[PDB]
Design a protein around this ligand. Structure first.
Ligand SMILES: CC(=O)CCC=C(C)C
Length: 125
């Protein structure tokens, strides 16, 4: 079952809420559209270069990157609500080592990898 779970409990409302202002900042900086974000979240993987940098911006704004701006997966896992701890771990267990030239490339690589592993529970806002 690969259909996206979207209800009052999941994605966690408190997480969506905390991310919203970061979304406003990162959408403003990169010029990505809302539609591009929703389509990646809920339908099919697609390559939009501004979406990739939006994704990178979100990791930075969320303070889950190391000193070189790379995603620090332990910090990301700790920043998630406890209720999604196990799902996120299985979703990321074969996505440990991102490939790509730029920080935007590696951020896209991760998101794509998480979405392929568990498209029901994967989301982007
Ligand atoms: C937080 C997430 O989505 C992936 C984390 C992956 C680990 C801890 C192996």
């Amino acid at each position: 079952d690969t259909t996206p779970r979207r209800d009052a409990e999941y994605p966690p409302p408190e997480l969506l809420e905390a991310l919203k202002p970061l979304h406003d900042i990162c959408l403003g900086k990169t010029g990505v559209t809302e539609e591009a974000i929703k389509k990646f979240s809920d339908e099919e993987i697609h390559e939009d270069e501004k979406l990739k940098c939006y994704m990178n911006c979100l990791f930075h704004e969320a303070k889950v990157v190391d000193d070189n701006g790379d995603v620090h997966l332990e910090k990301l896992h700790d920043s998630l609500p406890s209720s999604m701890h196990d799902i996120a771990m299985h979703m990321g267990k074969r996505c440990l080592y991102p490939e790509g030239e730029t920080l935007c490339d590696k951020a896209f690589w991760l998101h794509k990898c998480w979405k392929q592993s568990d498209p029901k529970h994967y989301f982007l806002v």
